[PDB]
Write an enzyme that holds these catalytic residues in place. Structure first.
Site, mmCIF file in Angstrom:
data_model
loop_
_atom_site.group_PDB
_atom_site.id
_atom_site.type_symbol
_atom_site.label_atom_id
_atom_site.label_comp_id
_atom_site.label_asym_id
_atom_site.label_seq_id
_atom_site.Cartn_x
_atom_site.Cartn_y
_atom_site.Cartn_z
ATOM 1 N N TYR A 166 3.804 9.733 0.842
ATOM 2 C CA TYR A 166 4.439 9.634 1.800
ATOM 3 C C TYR A 166 5.973 9.783 1.001
ATOM 4 O O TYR A 166 6.645 9.448 2.540
ATOM 5 C CB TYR A 166 4.642 7.811 1.846
ATOM 6 C CG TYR A 166 2.447 7.388 2.538
ATOM 7 C CD1 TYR A 166 2.090 7.620 2.905
ATOM 8 C CD2 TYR A 166 2.454 6.026 2.296
ATOM 9 C CE1 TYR A 166 0.731 7.604 2.813
ATOM 10 C CE2 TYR A 166 0.984 5.700 2.605
ATOM 11 C CZ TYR A 166 0.588 5.834 2.444
ATOM 12 O OH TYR A 166 -1.444 6.064 3.496
ATOM 13 N N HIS A 198 -7.235 9.636 -2.018
ATOM 14 C CA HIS A 198 -7.297 9.508 -0.958
ATOM 15 C C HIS A 198 -7.300 10.065 0.524
ATOM 16 O O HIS A 198 -7.455 9.324 1.255
ATOM 17 C CB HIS A 198 -5.608 10.380 -0.380
ATOM 18 C CG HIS A 198 -4.089 10.110 0.227
ATOM 19 N ND1 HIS A 198 -3.276 9.836 0.072
ATOM 20 C CD2 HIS A 198 -4.746 9.278 1.314
ATOM 21 C CE1 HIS A 198 -3.001 9.060 1.314
ATOM 22 N NE2 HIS A 198 -3.669 8.958 2.383
ATOM 23 N N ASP A 238 0.513 -1.425 0.277
ATOM 24 C CA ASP A 238 -0.370 -0.260 -0.290
ATOM 25 C C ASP A 238 0.875 1.369 0.367
ATOM 26 O O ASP A 238 1.764 1.046 0.788
ATOM 27 C CB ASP A 238 -0.395 -0.319 1.365
ATOM 28 C CG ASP A 238 -1.825 1.364 1.442
ATOM 29 O OD1 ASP A 238 -2.649 1.156 0.379
ATOM 30 O OD2 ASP A 238 -1.255 2.448 1.774
ATOM 31 N N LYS A 263 -2.979 6.618 -3.895
ATOM 32 C CA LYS A 263 -3.853 7.520 -3.716
ATOM 33 C C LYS A 263 -3.035 8.833 -4.128
ATOM 34 O O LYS A 263 -2.204 9.433 -4.116
ATOM 35 C CB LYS A 263 -3.626 7.753 -2.923
ATOM 36 C CG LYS A 263 -3.855 6.157 -1.437
ATOM 37 C CD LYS A 263 -4.189 5.591 0.013
ATOM 38 C CE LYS A 263 -3.303 4.827 0.359
ATOM 39 N NZ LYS A 263 -1.937 4.681 0.938
HETATM 40 N N1 LIG Z 1 -5.481 5.855 3.408
HETATM 41 C C1 LIG Z 1 -5.526 6.656 4.474
HETATM 42 O O1 LIG Z 1 -4.974 7.450 4.638
HETATM 43 C C2 LIG Z 1 -4.408 5.779 5.310
HETATM 44 C C3 LIG Z 1 -3.799 6.934 7.187
HETATM 45 C C4 LIG Z 1 -3.268 5.578 7.790
HETATM 46 C C5 LIG Z 1 -2.429 4.803 7.026
HETATM 47 N N2 LIG Z 1 -2.643 4.357 5.999
HETATM 48 C C6 LIG Z 1 -2.081 2.770 5.271
HETATM 49 O O2 LIG Z 1 -2.139 2.376 6.822
HETATM 50 C C7 LIG Z 1 -0.437 1.888 7.089
HETATM 51 C C8 LIG Z 1 -0.620 1.350 8.430
HETATM 52 O O3 LIG Z 1 -1.227 2.473 9.315
HETATM 53 P P1 LIG Z 1 0.071 2.682 10.068
HETATM 54 O O4 LIG Z 1 0.840 3.609 9.118
HETATM 55 O O5 LIG Z 1 -1.133 3.907 10.297
HETATM 56 O O6 LIG Z 1 0.133 1.875 11.512
HETATM 57 P P2 LIG Z 1 -0.247 -0.068 11.804
HETATM 58 O O7 LIG Z 1 -0.007 -0.376 10.897
HETATM 59 O O8 LIG Z 1 -0.799 0.138 12.981
HETATM 60 O O9 LIG Z 1 1.699 0.786 12.750
HETATM 61 C C9 LIG Z 1 2.175 0.407 12.243
HETATM 62 C C10 LIG Z 1 2.949 0.503 13.827
HETATM 63 O O10 LIG Z 1 3.895 -0.476 14.248
HETATM 64 C C11 LIG Z 1 4.411 -1.644 14.360
HETATM 65 N N3 LIG Z 1 4.722 -2.846 14.503
HETATM 66 C C12 LIG Z 1 3.995 -3.682 12.988
HETATM 67 N N4 LIG Z 1 4.075 -4.820 13.004
HETATM 68 C C13 LIG Z 1 4.321 -4.736 14.353
HETATM 69 C C14 LIG Z 1 4.557 -6.270 14.999
HETATM 70 N N5 LIG Z 1 3.923 -7.102 15.123
HETATM 71 N N6 LIG Z 1 4.521 -5.857 16.176
HETATM 72 C C15 LIG Z 1 5.393 -4.526 17.548
HETATM 73 N N7 LIG Z 1 4.843 -3.679 16.848
HETATM 74 C C16 LIG Z 1 4.492 -3.358 15.289
HETATM 75 C C17 LIG Z 1 5.400 -0.507 13.912
HETATM 76 O O11 LIG Z 1 6.900 -0.335 13.854
HETATM 77 P P3 LIG Z 1 8.018 -0.924 12.777
HETATM 78 O O12 LIG Z 1 7.846 -0.559 11.453
HETATM 79 O O13 LIG Z 1 9.153 0.056 13.589
HETATM 80 O O14 LIG Z 1 8.310 -2.544 13.009
HETATM 81 C C18 LIG Z 1 4.995 0.741 13.434
HETATM 82 O O15 LIG Z 1 5.307 1.654 14.556
HETATM 83 C C19 LIG Z 1 0.302 2.661 6.806
HETATM 84 O O16 LIG Z 1 1.526 2.494 6.581
HETATM 85 C C20 LIG Z 1 -0.676 2.623 4.930
HETATM 86 O O17 LIG Z 1 0.043 2.282 4.272
HETATM 87 C C21 LIG Z 1 -3.591 5.322 5.270
HETATM 88 N N1 LIG Z 2 -3.661 13.824 8.942
HETATM 89 C C1 LIG Z 2 -3.938 12.521 9.013
HETATM 90 O O1 LIG Z 2 -4.652 12.593 9.372
HETATM 91 C C2 LIG Z 2 -3.169 12.101 8.100
HETATM 92 C C3 LIG Z 2 -3.169 10.854 7.742
HETATM 93 C C4 LIG Z 2 -2.306 10.456 6.706
HETATM 94 N N2 LIG Z 2 -1.301 9.009 6.976
HETATM 95 C C5 LIG Z 2 -1.670 8.367 5.985
HETATM 96 O O2 LIG Z 2 -1.337 7.370 5.843
HETATM 97 N N3 LIG Z 2 -2.594 9.293 4.687
HETATM 98 C C6 LIG Z 2 -2.988 10.070 5.457
HETATM 99 O O3 LIG Z 2 -3.279 10.861 5.011
HETATM 100 C C7 LIG Z 2 -0.771 11.362 6.386
HETATM 101 C C8 LIG Z 2 0.434 11.343 5.245
HETATM 102 C C9 LIG Z 2 1.101 11.694 5.476
HETATM 103 F F1 LIG Z 2 1.968 11.788 4.708
HETATM 104 C C10 LIG Z 2 0.839 13.369 5.976
HETATM 105 C C11 LIG Z 2 0.006 13.629 6.462
HETATM 106 C C12 LIG Z 2 -1.436 12.924 6.732
HETATM 107 O O4 LIG Z 2 -1.995 12.776 8.004
#
Ligand SMILES: NC(=O)c1ccc[n+]([C@@H]2O[C@H](COP(=O)([O-])OP(=O)(O)OC[C@H]3O[C@@H](n4cnc5c(N)ncnc54)[C@H](OP(=O)(O)O)[C@@H]3O)[C@@H](O)[C@H]2O)c1
Ligand SMILES: NC(=O)[C@@H]1C[C@]2(NC(=O)NC2=O)c2cc(F)ccc2O1
Length: 315
Positions: free
Chosen positions: A48, A110, A43, A77
């Site tokens: 990013y 996004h 993803d 996105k």
């Molecule tokens: N559409 C949007 O608006 C949007 C918004 C937010 C997120 N996203 C997408 O969703 C993905 C996931 O969400 P997120 O990045 O917010 O957070 P998450 O996946 O809920 O959490 C990531 C955090 O968890 C840690 N972690 C991962 N696996 C672990 C495990 N097995 N044990 C302990 N800690 C662990 C990671 O550490 P390390 O990396 O240090 O291992 C990092 O600090 C994003 O990266 C992005 O691709 C999209």
């Molecule tokens: N404040 C929010 O809710 C969003 C979260 C968010 N993370 C993510 O994966 N999608 C998003 O849009 C994000 C990522 C960025 F690189 C910069 C800003 C940012 O803001």
């Protein structure tokens, strides 16, 4: 089963690697390790600021014949400053170039909110408010549909759309392609029963983001709830001889969601993938659902004035 059927007729791996906050000097190896261990869905997003580095990994593993392109499911996105019809194609092609792909399996709007175009991702006025764009999401959607008709993307979708906004696209005059996916925040503290039910009723696959609670989010505070350390969730993991993270990933899987945990740690990347060998009981699932507290990690708090801000509505 490792993949779910989209309304475009393609199959999507229900487990993907997230890449938000993955440092550009660590994410190439993270994606190489992920593909080596069996991940087939990555993803991504232009905002990013690391797609070039993700792309390096994808390309090397195609080159190494670790995987075939048909076997990968790559998602990106369209950022808010590119909602204008004239900028959508360009945004997509820059992402493609960076990812070194000739198509995306899935391209998402996004956020339903459009911002003023420019270099800045969060353009501000002199008083600190984000400057909106006059584009609405129905014209943005038609531009996404063009991408399909030009072969740049196999599927199009939305992210952070509330149910009234999903509905607006569903009811768009002249709608050509329905959204395939709505990517939203989802975890035991934000269970999203209503929105998921609505999307699934419409044939729209939901992807759960921040499934671990985004413990590396920049605005975390030592007093916030922590899924990973919630002893109730620990207990359920212990019982199944799994880690808490594995439980938190298996949970949306059994709700017929797609889930995209982020890690740049090789050990965790592998850990997170070993979720196909156990089952949560119905009871476990209802118990996990009971922990809902409408706690949102990603609320775009710098732009709550936008006309299209999604989280004033209940769902
Ligand atoms: N559409 C949007 O608006 C949007 C918004 C937010 C997120 N996203 C997408 O969703 C993905 C996931 O969400 P997120 O990045 O917010 O957070 P998450 O996946 O809920 O959490 C990531 C955090 O968890 C840690 N972690 C991962 N696996 C672990 C495990 N097995 N044990 C302990 N800690 C662990 C990671 O550490 P390390 O990396 O240090 O291992 C990092 O600090 C994003 O990266 C992005 O691709 C999209
Ligand atoms: N404040 C929010 O809710 C969003 C979260 C968010 N993370 C993510 O994966 N999608 C998003 O849009 C994000 C990522 C960025 F690189 C910069 C800003 C940012 O803001």
């Amino acid at each position: 089963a490792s993949r779910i059927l989209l309304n475009n007729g393609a199959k999507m791996p229900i487990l993907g690697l997230g890449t938000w906050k993955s440092p550009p000097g660590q994410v190439t190896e993270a994606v190489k390790v992920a593909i080596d261990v069996g991940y087939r869905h990555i993803d991504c997003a232009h905002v990013y600021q690391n797609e070039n580095e993700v792309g390096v990994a994808i390309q090397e593993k195609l080159r190494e014949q670790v995987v075939k392109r048909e076997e990968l499911f790559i998602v990106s996105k369209l950022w808010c400053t590119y909602h204008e019809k004239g900028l959508v194609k360009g945004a997509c092609q820059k992402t493609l170039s960076d990812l070194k792909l000739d198509y995306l399996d899935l391209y998402l709007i996004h956020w339903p909110t459009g911002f003023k175009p420019g270099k800045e991702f969060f353009p501000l006025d002199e008083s600190g408010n984000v400057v909106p764009s006059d584009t609405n999401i129905l014209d943005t959607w038609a531009a996404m549909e063009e991408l399909v008709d030009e072969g740049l993307v196999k599927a199009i979708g939305i992210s952070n759309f509330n149910h009234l906004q999903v509905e607006m696209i569903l009811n768009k005059p002249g709608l050509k392609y329905k959204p395939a996916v709505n990517q939203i925040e989802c975890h035991p503290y934000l269970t999203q029963e209503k929105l998921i039910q609505y999307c699934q009723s419409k044939g729209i696959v939901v992807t759960a983001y921040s499934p671990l609670g985004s413990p590396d989010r920049p605005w975390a505070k030592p007093e916030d709830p922590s899924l990973l350390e919630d002893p109730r969730i620990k207990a359920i993991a212990a019982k199944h001889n799994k880690t808490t993270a594995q439980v938190l990933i298996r949970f949306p899987m059994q709700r017929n969601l797609v889930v995209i945990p982020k890690s740049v740690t090789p050990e965790r990347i592998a850990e997170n993938f070993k979720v196909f060998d156990f089952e949560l009981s119905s009871q476990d699932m209802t118990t996990l659902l009971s922990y809902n507290r409408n706690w949102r990690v990603c609320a775009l708090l710098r732009d709550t004035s936008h006309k299209d801000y999604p989280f004033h509505e209940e769902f």
